[PDB]
Amino acid sequence: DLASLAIYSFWIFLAGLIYYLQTENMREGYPLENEDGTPAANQGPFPLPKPKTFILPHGRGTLTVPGPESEDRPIALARTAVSEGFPHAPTGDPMKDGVGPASWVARRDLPELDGHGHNKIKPMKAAAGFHVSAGKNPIGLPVRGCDLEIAGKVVDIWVDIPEQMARFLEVELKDGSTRLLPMQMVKVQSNRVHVNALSSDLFAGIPTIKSPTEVTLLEEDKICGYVAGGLMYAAPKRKS
Amino acid sequence: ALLSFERKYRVPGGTLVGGNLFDFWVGPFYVGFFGVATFFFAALGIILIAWSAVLQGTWNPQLISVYPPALEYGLGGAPLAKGGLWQIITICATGAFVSWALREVEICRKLGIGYHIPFAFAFAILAYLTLVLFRPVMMGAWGYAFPYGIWTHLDWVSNTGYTYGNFHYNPAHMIAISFFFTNALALALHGALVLSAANPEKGKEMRTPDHEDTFFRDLVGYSIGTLGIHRLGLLLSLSAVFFSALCMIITGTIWFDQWVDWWQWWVKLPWWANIPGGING
Amino acid sequence: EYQNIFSQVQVRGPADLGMTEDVNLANRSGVGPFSTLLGWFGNAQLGPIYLGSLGVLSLFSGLMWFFTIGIWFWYQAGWNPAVFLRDLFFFSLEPPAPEYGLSFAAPLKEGGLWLIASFFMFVAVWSWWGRTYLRAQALGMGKHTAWAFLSAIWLWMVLGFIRPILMGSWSEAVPYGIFSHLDWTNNFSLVHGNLFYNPFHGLSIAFLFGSALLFAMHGATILAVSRFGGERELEQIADRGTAAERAALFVRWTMGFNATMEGIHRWAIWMAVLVTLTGGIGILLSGTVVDNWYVWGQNHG
Ligand code: BCL
Ligand code: BCL
Ligand code: BCL
Ligand SMILES: CC[C@H]1c2cc3[nH]c4c(c3C)C(=O)[C@H](C(=O)OC)c4c3nc(cc4[nH]c(cc(n2)[C@@H]1C)c(C(C)=O)c4C)[C@@H](C)[C@@H]3CCC(=O)OC/C=C(\C)CCC[C@H](C)CCC[C@H](C)CCCC(C)C
Ligand SMILES: COC(C)(C)C/C=C/C(C)=C/C=C/C(C)=C/C=C/C(C)=C/C=C\C=C(C)\C=C\C=C(/C)CC/C=C(\C)CCC=C(C)C
Ligand SMILES: CCCCCCCCCCCC[N+](C)(C)[O-]
Ligand SMILES: CCCCCCCCCCCC[N+](C)(C)[O-]
Numbered sequence: 077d078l079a080s081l082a083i084y085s086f087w088i089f090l091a092g093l094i095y096y097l098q099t100e101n102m103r104e105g106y107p108l109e110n111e112d113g114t115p116a117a118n119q120g121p122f123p124l125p126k127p128k129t130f131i132l133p134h135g136r137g138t139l140t141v142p143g144p145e146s147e148d149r150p151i152a153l154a155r156t157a158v159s160e161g162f163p164h165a166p167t168g169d170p171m172k173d174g175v176g177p178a179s180w181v182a183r184r185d186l187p188e189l190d191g192h193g194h195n196k197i198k199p200m201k202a203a204a205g206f207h208v209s210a211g212k213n214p215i216g217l218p219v220r221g222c223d224l225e226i227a228g229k230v231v232d233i234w235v236d237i238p239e240q241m242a243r244f245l246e247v248e249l250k251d252g253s254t255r256l257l258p259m260q261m262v263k264v265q266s267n268r269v270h271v272n273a274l275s276s277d278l279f280a281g282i283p284t285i286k287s288p289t290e291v292t293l294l295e296e297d298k299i300c301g302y303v304a305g306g307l308m309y310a311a312p313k314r315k316s
Numbered sequence: 317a318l319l320s321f322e323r324k325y326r327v328p329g330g331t332l333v334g335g336n337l338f339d340f341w342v343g344p345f346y347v348g349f350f351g352v353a354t355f356f357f358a359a360l361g362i363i364l365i366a367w368s369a370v371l372q373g374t375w376n377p378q379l380i381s382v383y384p385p386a387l388e389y390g391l392g393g394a395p396l397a398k399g400g401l402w403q404i405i406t407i408c409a410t411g412a413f414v415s416w417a418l419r420e421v422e423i424c425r426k427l428g429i430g431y432h433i434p435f436a437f438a439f440a441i442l443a444y445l446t447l448v449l450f451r452p453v454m455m456g457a458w459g460y461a462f463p464y465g466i467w468t469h470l471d472w473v474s475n476t477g478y479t480y481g482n483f484h485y486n487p488a489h490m491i492a493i494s495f496f497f498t499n500a501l502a503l504a505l506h507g508a509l510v511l512s513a514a515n516p517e518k519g520k521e522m523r524t525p526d527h528e529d530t531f532f533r534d535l536v537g538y539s540i541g542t543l544g545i546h547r548l549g550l551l552l553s554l555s556a557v558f559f560s561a562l563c564m565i566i567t568g569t570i571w572f573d574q575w576v577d578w579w580q581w582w583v584k585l586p587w588w589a590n591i592p593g594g595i596n597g
Numbered sequence: 598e599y600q601n602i603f604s605q606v607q608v609r610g611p612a613d614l615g616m617t618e619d620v621n622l623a624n625r626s627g628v629g630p631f632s633t634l635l636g637w638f639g640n641a642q643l644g645p646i647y648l649g650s651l652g653v654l655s656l657f658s659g660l661m662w663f664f665t666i667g668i669w670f671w672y673q674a675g676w677n678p679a680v681f682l683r684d685l686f687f688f689s690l691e692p693p694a695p696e697y698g699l700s701f702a703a704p705l706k707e708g709g710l711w712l713i714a715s716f717f718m719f720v721a722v723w724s725w726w727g728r729t730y731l732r733a734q735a736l737g738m739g740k741h742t743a744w745a746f747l748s749a750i751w752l753w754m755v756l757g758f759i760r761p762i763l764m765g766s767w768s769e770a771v772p773y774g775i776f777s778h779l780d781w782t783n784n785f786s787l788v789h790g791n792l793f794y795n796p797f798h799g800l801s802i803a804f805l806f807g808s809a810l811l812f813a814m815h816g817a818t819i820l821a822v823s824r825f826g827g828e829r830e831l832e833q834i835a836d837r838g839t840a841a842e843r844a845a846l847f848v849r850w851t852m853g854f855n856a857t858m859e860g861i862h863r864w865a866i867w868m869a870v871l872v873t874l875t876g877g878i879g880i881l882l883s884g885t886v887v888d889n890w891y892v893w894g895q896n897h898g
């Protein structure tokens with residue numbers, strides 16, 4: 077009858093849909109590799125999809141996925157076992173080297189632009205008309221690390237102009253230079269900003285940005301990866 | 317094997333129990349101590365379900381059903397064949413669910429990300445425990461719990477609901493249904509909005525978050541934004557499950573009459589309770 | 598630790614008049630105020646809104662639907678505001694009696710008003726649909742919102758329009774009332790032998806529950822990786838960063854399959870539209886083709 081026909085029709089449609097969906101989610105990170113980087117023999121049941129091409133705004137070219145994958149940076153790790161499946165030990169400083177939870181991806185050394193072609197993120201001192209409108213203004217507060225020591229003070233907020241939100245604190249260190257701190261990794265309090273991820277001695281190691289009025293997508297990743305990695309790698313200096 | 321970008325994340329550490337003992341993967345799967353625990357509880361539960369199928373006399377998946385003890389066993393144990401298997405399996409299922417949440421915390425620590433996912437998953441574990449643990453304990457018998465069976469768990473929903481008239485009248489049920497409905501709407505919009513920007517009119521360049529905020533403002537006058545939409549989806553669905561657990565923890569415990577009759581507090585309010593006409597008097 | 602559910606600091610700049618593209622700027626309002634309250638969770642800015650011919654048409658229609666129902670509620674209350682307040686949930690604007698078939702000749706007090714209000718609702722919703730399509734066109738975006746919106750319109754069209762016509766009477770349609778539309782739903786299932794046996798109801802429930810699982814996982818994830826700029830999803834599609842990598846590896850290490858930044862949004866749109874798509878088929882077949890889902894399920898078909 078007509079209802080059994082409808083419910084068989086649907087299950088076949090759903091099989092096709094799941095297939096389409098699984099292959100759409102294969103457009104990054106494939107083909108699979110062995111831990112030495114050569115292509116794995118077994119790539120799974122579904123094949124790769126035909127490539128698609130994104131036209132990027134503002135004259136920044138195209139992207140085609142799937143397409144040639146390369147880390148485009150050195151990975152300072154070594155095998156800890158003789159068979160597949162075990163962890164890879166850092167061979168140096170995992171925070172200096174950008175591995176594990178401190179990892180960064182080699183994105184474009186360009187800033188993200190808004191719908192008009194201007195830099196998305198600007199320090200507030202250069203964003204006309206932008207001010208703190210609610211909450212505690214962190215500018216001027218000292219910054220405390222997880223070792224309960226003071227590493228610097230907030231000298232600006234870097235803001236998302238089109239989305240009107242704070243994205244980075246700009247911290248001045250005891251030697252006069254500044255670093256960016258992700259907003260999502262600080263705790264603003266009445267009389268201080270507290271940073272759980274980093275101990276005070278690790279602030280100088282935060283990657284620095286090359287022009288002082290803009291931050292590129294690559295530097296954003298290095299900064300954020302570094303700060304997040306301190307949760308694992310700076311635990312020998314965390315207190316309650 | 318490994319995603320092309322995966323090797324740099326497969327570092328030692330982040331575990332909560334065991335140190336480096338179970339700090340390894342099987343194919344794509346992280347294991348960890350709670351990976352082993354999950355496998356142990358799951359394996360045990362499955363075996364116990366197959367044993368339940370032997371005692372019940374059928375192997376059809378649409379017919380297998382593990383029932384709780386009868387109501388007369390109160391909150392004691394019961395023989396295996398008559399509710400004991402449900403009791404052990406219920407323990408196993410809790411072990412597997414909690415181990416799953418904790419294995420996720422371990423995955424979160426290695427990856428250096430926040431704990432929002434396992435936290436969200438704990439609300440689903442909470443709704444399950446309301447149905448099989450908190451509510452039966454408060455009502456004084458395991459028998460008020462639901463059976464493990466594809467279709468019989470549905471029969472329990474119908475019977476339990478109709479014990480109180482049309483269950484639609486539970487006011488916490490009403491609120492929970494709203495969050496479920498609003499969640500699905502917000503998920504459709506969120507998916508539609510990102511894709512419509514990534515995938516513009518043919519030959520046009522990729523749009524920007526600005527186009528996304530412009531679209532919603534043009535349409536309804538307000539855009540919650542790209543961080544807010546994800547805050548919203550988290551809150552909408554966690555709320556829906558919270559009010560689900562609530563709508564059942566109060567049913568049969570503090571309210572046990574027909575749910576439609578609860579609404580007579582509004583109607584009987586003294587200033588209008590005797591004005592004639594309308595629908596009520 | 599900081600969770601990113603609410604913002605610690607709010608910043609504000611000039612009001613964002615928005616992207617222009619091919620939009621007719623003559624039809625954008627002024628910006629509303631800024632809400633600090635909304636600012637803790639999402640954006641603070643209200644406005645502007647776009648109102649063209651379709652927008653006025655849809656809004657005037659929808660108000661006329663709302664008012665027609667509320668005028669009837671006042672009549673049932675004998676125009677007594679205390680009765681109106683007391684019995685608000687119990688008032689109901691019912692469709693014509695079965696005797697009137699699909700005819701428009703039913704008297705106002707016995708269904709004709711239901712038809713007026715349904716006509717206003719019919720206009721209101723389809724105008725709004727064309728509006729979701731044309732707002733996307735002006736900005737140069739895909740029509741994903743309009744097509745997804747179509748999936749909800751389908752269930753609504755089935756309940757109040759297509760099924761009544763196939764059944765041959767307007768009385769099959771849903772009444773306008775709080776408790777009465779709840780009763781109608783309960784009644785519908787009893788009369789068709791338990792909707793729990795309707796396999797499309799069962800799938801619909803799966804996608805509804807699944808939608809909650811998915812938005813829970815997706816929103817939790819993006820907040821979990823918002824320390825790496827994760828919520829900036831379009832740029833992460835154009836130029837994968839460590840947020841997208843870590844979000845994928847969570848899903849891989851947890852349950853073994855892959856999820857890209859774009860891919861996860863295809864799951865999102867489909868999980869959601871499938872709720873009302875399958876739902877509409879389950880209602881459409883109830884009473885037209887299948888009288889009793891329990892009986893139907895006994896022959897498994
Ligand atoms: C005749 C039936 C009654 C009725 C009686 C009931 C009863 C009875 C109950 C509900 C409850 C609910 N009803 Mg009601 N309900 C009716 C009509 C409706 C309508 C409608 C349109 O009419 C709607 C939308 C709803 C909606 C809902 C929700 C508010 C809620 C279910 C979600 C939930 O608890 O998730 C919570 C999620 C879970 C429990 C899932 C947990 C999953 C676990 C943690 C992990 C699973 C792992 C799994 C084993 C792994 C699988 C293996 C794989 C290999 C990995 N009801 C009618 C009037 N309703 C239920 C509720 O609120 O429960 C708390 C409930 O008990
Ligand atoms: C939530 C409120 C009610 C309830 C009311 C309903 C109603 C009403 C319906 C279901 C439906 C289903 N419910 Mg139930 N159900 C509840 C509690 C549960 C629990 C639990 C808490 O342990 C589980 C595991 C299930 C499992 C299921 C499936 C048999 C089915 C599809 C689920 C789905 O898509 O979810 C959303 C999840 C996803 C999309 C992710 C993938 C989930 C997979 C498919 C789960 C497979 C579980 C498997 C069959 C049993 C595991 C056994 C062991 C592994 C051996 N229900 C409580 C008692 N459930 C529907 C159905 O068709 O039933 C016949 C249906 O109509
Ligand atoms: C006693 C009651 C019966 C029952 C009777 C029904 C009936 C009858 C129906 C459902 C339907 C549904 N049921 Mg059931 N259901 C029962 C038990 C359950 C249980 C459970 C026990 O746990 C659950 C979880 C569900 C779950 C579900 C949903 C999956 C599904 C509705 C989808 C949806 O999004 O609708 C909500 C979405 C809409 C109604 C779409 C609305 C779109 C329109 C265009 C919006 C216009 C808004 C308008 C302009 C007003 C705006 C106001 C202002 C702008 C703010 N049912 C029992 C067995 N159920 C529906 C379905 O599809 O079944 C197959 C349905 O019709
Ligand atoms: C809180 C919001 C929603 C939510 C969220 C959510 N679910 C989640 C997560 C989150 C955030 C996860 O992180 C986690 C996950 O990893 O998903 C991919 C999970 C997940 N939610 C799942 C299911 C699920 N979630 C549901 C609901 C919801 N999940 C909520 C609506 C439902 C519903 C509505 O019914 C189901 C069925 C899984 C896919 C997964 C958890 C997997 C897990 O715990 O694996 C360990 C357990 C086993 C491998 C099997 C153990 C077997 C037992 C020992 C025996 C069987 C006992 C059982 C009681 C029998 C019952 C069968 C009958 C009822 C038919
Ligand atoms: C404050 O008081 C005043 C008077 C100012 C205003 C008061 C307003 C009030 C109290 C409003 C209350 C509104 C309520 C309670 C509304 C509830 C609505 C509900 C619950 C609706 C539920 C479902 C509706 C559905 C499924 C409707 C579907 C309708 C259609 C698909 C339309 C089909 C079209 C038809 C039949 C007509 C077509 C005719 C032609 C000629 C094309
Ligand atoms: C009901 C939509 C959600 C809130 C948006 C309200 C309308 C925003 C437009 C306000 C602008 C009008 N005005 C007079 C302030 O300029
Ligand atoms: C569950 C509530 C829904 C969120 C809506 C807006 C809530 C306002 C939250 C304000 C809290 C911010 N504060 C003051 C703690 O910094």
Ligand SMILES: CCCCCCCCCCCC[N+](C)(C)[O-]
Pocket residue numbers: 094795796797799800803807868
């Ligand atoms: C795109 C997500 C795929 C999820 C599908 C899950 C199917 C579970 C429900 C199947 C059983 C329901 N029923 C009645 C049709 O048998």
Ligand SMILES: [Cl-]
Pocket residue numbers: 554555558
């Ligand atoms: Cl909550």
Ligand SMILES: [Fe+3]
Pocket residue numbers: 506510546815819830862
């Ligand atoms: Fe997203």
